[PDB]
Amino acid sequence: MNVLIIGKGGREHTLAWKAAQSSLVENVFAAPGNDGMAASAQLVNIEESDHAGLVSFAKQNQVGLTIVGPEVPLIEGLVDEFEKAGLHVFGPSKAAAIIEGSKQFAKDLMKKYDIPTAEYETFTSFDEAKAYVQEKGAPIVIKADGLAAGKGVTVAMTEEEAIACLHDFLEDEKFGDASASVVIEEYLSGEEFSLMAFVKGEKVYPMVIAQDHKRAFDGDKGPNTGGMGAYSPVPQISEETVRHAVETIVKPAAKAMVQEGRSFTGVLYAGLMLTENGSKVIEFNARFGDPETQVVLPRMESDLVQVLLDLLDDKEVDLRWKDTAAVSVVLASEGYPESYAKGTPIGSLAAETEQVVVFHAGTKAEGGEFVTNGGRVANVTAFDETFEAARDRVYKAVDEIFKPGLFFRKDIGARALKAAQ
Ligand SMILES: Nc1ncnc2c1ncn2[C@@H]1O[C@H](COP(=O)(O)OP(=O)(O)O)[C@@H](O)[C@H]1O
Numbered sequence: 553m554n555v556l557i558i559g560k561g562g563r564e565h566t567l568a569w570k571a572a573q574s575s576l577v578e579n580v581f582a583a584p585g586n587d588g589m590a591a592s593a594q595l596v597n598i599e600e601s602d603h604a605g606l607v608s609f610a611k612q613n614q615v616g617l618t619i620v621g622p623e624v625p626l627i628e629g630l631v632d633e634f635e636k637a638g639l640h641v642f643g644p645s646k647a648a649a650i651i652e653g654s655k656q657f658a659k660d661l662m663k664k665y666d667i668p669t670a671e672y673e674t675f676t677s678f679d680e681a682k683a684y685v686q687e688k689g690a691p692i693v694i695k696a697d698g699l700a701a702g703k704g705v706t707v708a709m710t711e712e713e714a715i716a717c718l719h720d721f722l723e724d725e726k727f728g729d730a731s732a733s734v735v736i737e738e739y740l741s742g743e744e745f746s747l748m749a750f751v752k753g754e755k756v757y758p759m760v761i762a763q764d765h766k767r768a769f770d771g772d773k774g775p776n777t778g779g780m781g782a783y784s785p786v787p788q789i790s791e792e793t794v795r796h797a798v799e800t801i802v803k804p805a806a807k808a809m810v811q812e813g814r815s816f817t818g819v820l821y822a823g824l825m826l827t828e829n830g831s832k833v834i835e836f837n838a839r840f841g842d843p844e845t846q847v848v849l850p851r852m853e854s855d856l857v858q859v860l861l862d863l864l865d866d867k868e869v870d871l872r873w874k875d876t877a878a879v880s881v882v883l884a885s886e887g888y889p890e891s892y893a894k895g896t897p898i899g900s901l902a903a904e905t906e907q908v909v910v911f912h913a914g915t916k917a918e919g920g921e922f923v924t925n926g927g928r929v930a931n932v933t934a935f936d937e938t939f940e941a942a943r944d945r946v947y948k949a950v951d952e953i954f955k956p957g958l959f960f961r962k963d964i965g966a967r968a969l970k971a972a973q
C-alpha cells in the first residue's frame with residue numbers, strides 16, 4: 553500500500569515515521585512534508601491548500617490511505633474532495649470538522665448534549681459582548697469563533713483586557729469572519745491535558761493522554777506558543793480520570809455529532825481541564841494535536857496503518873499501547889512566538905543519544921545542514937520505561953543537538969513530575 557500523509561510540521565513527521573514502520577505499506581508520501589522527514593516519506597511538492605493537486609496526485613499514484621495532518625484543509629473540506637474522487641481517506645467531512653472550526657457550534661452542542669464545559673455566551677455585537685463582560689466580571693475568557701490561527705484566545709484578568717479583545721475581534725475584525733462571532737466563557741483552572749481518540753460515527757477508540765506547555769518561557773511565563781514540548785503519560789492524572797472523560801465527554805460528543813447529521817470519522821481531540829468539579833471541555837480539535845502526537849504515537853504498540861484501515865472498513869480495531877513513556881522538547885527560533893529568525897544554521901540536528909527521535913517542524917536542508925525554516929523548529933522526543941527517565945534523556949539529546957539561535961524550556965514535564973508525588 554501507498555500512504556499519503558498531508559502537512560509539513562512535526563505531527564506529520566511522526567505520522568510519516570509511524571506509517572513507515574507499517575508492514576502493509578510499500579510507499580509513504582508526504583505532501584509537502586519537510587526535509588527532516590525524508591527517510592520516512594518520499595516528499596511531494598504539492599502544498600496542502602492544493603486540494604485538486606492532492607486529489608489528482610493521490611488518485612493517479614494509487615494512494616490506498618491518505619492521512620490529513622492539519623485542520624484548515626479539513627475545515628475547508630479536503631476530505632469531501634477525496635471521497636468524490638473515490639479515494640480512501642482518514643479525517644472528518646467539512647460538516648464534521650465544524651466541531652473544531654466553529655467554537656460556537658461546539659459550545660452549543662456540548663450544551664445541547666449535556667457535555668461538561670465552561671459556561672458561556674456567544675456574541676456578534678460588541679456592545680452586547682462588553683455589557684456581558686461588565687456583568688460577569690473578570691477573570692473571563694474571550695474566544696474567537698473560527699480558526700484565527702491559535703492566536704485568538706485571550707484569558708482576561710481584567711474587564712479592560714476583555715473589552716479590548718472584543719474590540720479587536722468584533723469592532724476591528726482582527727480575524728475576519730473567524731472573529732465575526734465571539735465566545736465569552738468562564739475561567740476554569742487545574743491540570744490541562746489532551747485526550748485524543750480514533751472516532752468513526754459513535755465508535756470511539758481512546759488514545760493515551762498527553763499534556764503540553766502552551767507557554768513560551770520556563771515557569772510557564774511569557775506569551776503563548778504552539779507548543780514548547782509535551783509528554784505521555786501524564787502521571788498525576790489517574791486512569792479512572794481518563795476512563796471517565798472518555799465515557800462522559802468523548803463518546804457523547806461522537807454520538808452527538810452523528811445525531812446532528814455531522815458524523816465524525818478522524819481524530820477527535822478533547823483538550824480538557826480537570827477542575828475541582830471534574831473534567832470539562834476547553835475545546836475540540838478535529839485532528840491529531842501538535843505536539844501531542846510526537847509523544848503519543850510512539851507509545852502505540854499497534855500498527856497505525858492497520859488501525860486506520862480497520863476503522864475505515866468497519867472491523868474490530870485492535871489498539872494496543874506501550875508502557876514506555878515519551879517526552880518531547882521544542883527547539884524554537886529566537887523571537888517566537890513573535891517575529892522570528894529564518895535562515896539560522898543549526899547543524900545536523902541528529903542526536904547521539906539512543907531512544908531519541910527529532911521530529912522536524914520548521915527546517916530546511918541547505919548546505920549539508922539544516923537551516924531554521926519556522927517559528928518552532930524541532931521536537932526532540934525521547935522514550936523510556938518511566939517518565940523522569942525519559943525526561944532526563946530528552947535534555948541530554950536537547951543538549952547534544954542544540955545549536956546557537958535556538959532556545960527552549962528546561963522545565964518540561966517538571967511540574968507534572970513533582971505534583972505526581
Ligand atoms: N475557559 C478557559 N479557562 C481557562 N483557560 C482557558 C479557557 N479556554 C482556554 N484556555 C487556555 O487557552 C488555551 C487556548 O484555548 P483553546 O480553547 O484551547 O483554543 P485554541 O484552538 O486557540 O487552542 C488553552 O490551551 C488553555 O491553556
Ligand SMILES: [Mg+2]
Pocket residue numbers: 823835
Ligand atoms: Mg488548544
Ligand SMILES: [Mg+2]
Pocket residue numbers: 652835836837
Ligand atoms: Mg483548537
Ligand SMILES: [Mg+2]
Pocket residue numbers: none
Ligand atoms: Mg487483521
